[PDB]
Motif scaffolding. Structure first.
Motif, PDB file in Angstrom:
ATOM      1  N   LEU A  59       0.798  -1.215   0.000  1.00 38.63           N
ATOM      2  CA  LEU A  59       0.000   0.000   0.000  1.00 38.63           C
ATOM      3  C   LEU A  59       0.842   1.282   0.000  1.00 38.63           C
ATOM      4  O   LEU A  59       0.560   2.212  -0.760  1.00 38.63           O
ATOM      5  CB  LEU A  59      -0.956  -0.029   1.191  1.00 38.63           C
ATOM      6  CG  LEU A  59      -2.106  -1.027   1.055  1.00 38.63           C
ATOM      7  CD1 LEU A  59      -2.670  -1.410   2.410  1.00 38.63           C
ATOM      8  CD2 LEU A  59      -3.194  -0.419   0.151  1.00 38.63           C
ATOM      9  N   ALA A  60       1.885   1.326   0.818  1.00 34.62           N
ATOM     10  CA  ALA A  60       2.720   2.506   0.895  1.00 34.62           C
ATOM     11  C   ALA A  60       3.363   2.835  -0.474  1.00 34.62           C
ATOM     12  O   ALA A  60       3.397   3.956  -0.954  1.00 34.62           O
ATOM     13  N   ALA A  61       3.865   1.786  -1.122  1.00 36.66           N
ATOM     14  CA  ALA A  61       4.487   1.903  -2.432  1.00 36.66           C
ATOM     15  C   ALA A  61       3.502   2.361  -3.536  1.00 36.66           C
ATOM     16  O   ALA A  61       3.885   3.075  -4.458  1.00 36.66           O
ATOM     17  CB  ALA A  61       5.150   0.571  -2.805  1.00 36.66           C
ATOM     18  N   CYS A  62       2.244   1.914  -3.440  1.00 36.62           N
ATOM     19  CA  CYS A  62       1.188   2.363  -4.348  1.00 36.62           C
ATOM     20  C   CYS A  62       1.009   3.868  -4.256  1.00 36.62           C
ATOM     21  O   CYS A  62       0.935   4.567  -5.274  1.00 36.62           O
ATOM     22  CB  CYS A  62      -0.117   1.642  -3.986  1.00 36.62           C
ATOM     23  SG  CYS A  62      -1.679   2.487  -4.423  1.00 36.62           S
ATOM     24  N   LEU A  63       0.938   4.380  -3.037  1.00 32.20           N
ATOM     25  CA  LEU A  63       0.790   5.811  -2.822  1.00 32.20           C
ATOM     26  C   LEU A  63       2.005   6.533  -3.400  1.00 32.20           C
ATOM     27  O   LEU A  63       1.871   7.521  -4.121  1.00 32.20           O
ATOM     28  CB  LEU A  63       0.692   6.107  -1.328  1.00 32.20           C
ATOM     29  CG  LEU A  63       0.647   7.557  -0.861  1.00 32.20           C
ATOM     30  CD1 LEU A  63      -0.480   8.276  -1.492  1.00 32.20           C
ATOM     31  CD2 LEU A  63       0.541   7.607   0.643  1.00 32.20           C
ATOM     32  N   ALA A  64       3.197   6.032  -3.073  1.00 32.29           N
ATOM     33  CA  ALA A  64       4.439   6.614  -3.576  1.00 32.29           C
ATOM     34  C   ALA A  64       4.404   6.775  -5.105  1.00 32.29           C
ATOM     35  O   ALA A  64       4.658   7.821  -5.698  1.00 32.29           O
TER      36      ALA A  64
END
Lengths: 9, 9
Positions: B1-6
């Motif tokens: 999820l964090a990487a998706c936002l990034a």
């Protein structure tokens, strides 16, 4: 690494 | 999820 290549190009 | 936002931004 793959993403690095993607970006570079 | 964090990487998706990034990536999205």
């Amino acid at each position: 690494l793959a993403a690095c290549l993607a970006q570079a190009l």
